[PDB]
Amino acid sequence: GVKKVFTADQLKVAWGDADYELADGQWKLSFAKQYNQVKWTLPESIEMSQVNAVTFQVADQKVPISLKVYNGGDDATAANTQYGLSGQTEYTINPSGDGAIDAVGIMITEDKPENATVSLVSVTFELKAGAG
Amino acid sequence: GVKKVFTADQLKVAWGDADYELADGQWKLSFAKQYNQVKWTLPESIEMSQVNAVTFQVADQKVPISLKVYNGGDDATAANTQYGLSGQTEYTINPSGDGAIDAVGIMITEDKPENATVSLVSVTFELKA
Numbered sequence: 001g002v003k004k005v006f007t008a009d010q011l012k013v014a015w016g017d018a019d020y021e022l023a024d025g026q027w028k029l030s031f032a033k034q035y036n037q038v039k040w041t042l043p044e045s046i047e048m049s050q051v052n053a054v055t056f057q058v059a060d061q062k063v064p065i066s067l068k069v070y071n072g073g074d075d076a077t078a079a080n081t082q083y084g085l086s087g088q089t090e091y092t093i094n095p096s097g098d099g100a101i102d103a104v105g106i107m108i109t110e111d112k113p114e115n116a117t118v119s120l121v122s123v124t125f126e127l128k129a130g131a132g
Numbered sequence: 133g134v135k136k137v138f139t140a141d142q143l144k145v146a147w148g149d150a151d152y153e154l155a156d157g158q159w160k161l162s163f164a165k166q167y168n169q170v171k172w173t174l175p176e177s178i179e180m181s182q183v184n185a186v187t188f189q190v191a192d193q194k195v196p197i198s199l200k201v202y203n204g205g206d207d208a209t210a211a212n213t214q215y216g217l218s219g220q221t222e223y224t225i226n227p228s229g230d231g232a233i234d235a236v237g238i239m240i241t242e243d244k245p246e247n248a249t250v251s252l253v254s255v256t257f258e259l260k261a
């Protein structure tokens with residue numbers, strides 16, 4: 001029930017081959033090629049077993065997006081990734097597995113992007129009931 | 133302390149004589165007259181005793197702003213208001229007094245507003261506990 005919310009200005013870019021800039025309080029992203037993406041580090045890691053849901057809030061979405069919750073590996077696991085999401089300003093991933101969530105990411109799967117842009121507003125971690 | 137964060141889309145407008153619209157995940161405001169303002173209700177009431185600091189995050193600020201933390205009266209108390217703020221994207225009020233915090237506000241004090249606009253991004257409650 002407890003929610004840890006990070007707005008865009010609290011998320012630092014760890015890696016990204018997309019184009020990104022923090023402007024007007026949002027991470028504004030532009031993608032030029034298939035699988036271009038950004039990875040952000042969390043200010044503090046959160047144990048995976050404590051998290052019920054991770055909700056990404058976006059704005060000005062002009063391309064379907066893929067969302068990732070990392071738990072310490074070189075990439076997010078398939079169970080912690082959702083692909084081709086469109087039509088909402090908030091998307092929820094219910095993650096599972098071991099270790100701690102250290103990062104999140106946004107990626108595109110479109111093979112020939114054109115005017116492929118989106119803004120990240122915030123990422124929210126809702127903890128399981130009784131997880132403190 | 134623990135931080136309870138409300139982004140713009142979680143904040144409901146209670147009252148406002150400023151112009152306001154929720155766009156691109158932000159409350160976008162325009163002020164045509166002195167003391168024009170918006171008051172938003174919070175998703176939940178928070179006891180004042182439990183609150184250390186309330187931090188307002190803004191974007192595209194084009195006019196100095198005044199910030200308010202309500203605690204049950206028809207207006208926010210002077211102790212819970214800060215006036216004429218400029219130059220930052222985050223401003224903090226350390227509130228005081230009785231009761232529960234259930235709303236926040238943004239106001240302009242400029243006497244002849246011109247292209248007076250600002251966006252609200254989020255409001256953060258830093259708790260003692």
Ligand SMILES: O[C@@H]1[C@@H](O)[C@H](O[C@@H]2CO[C@@H](O[C@@H]3CO[C@@H](O[C@@H]4CO[C@@H](O)[C@H](O)[C@H]4O)[C@H](O)[C@H]3O)[C@H](O)[C@H]2O)OC[C@H]1O
Binds near residue numbers: 034035107
């Ligand atoms: O419809 C859904 C399909 O889109 C989907 O396919 C998965 C799409 O993601 C694939 O994984 C990508 C592969 O690219 C990685 O990027 C590389 C990072 O290193 C760079 O050197 C390289 O240039 C990039 O390509 C990216 O991290 C990773 O996420 C995955 O293998 C596909 O399975 O599958 C589900 C369908 O429903």
Ligand SMILES: O[C@@H]1[C@@H](O)[C@H](O)OC[C@H]1O
Binds near residue numbers: 215
């Ligand atoms: O707080 C302000 C005070 O410091 C200044 O002197 O006059 C105007 C007030 O708003």
Ligand SMILES: [Cl-]
Binds near residue numbers: 024192
């Ligand atoms: Cl803007």
Ligand SMILES: [Cl-]
Binds near residue numbers: 060156
């Ligand atoms: Cl926009």
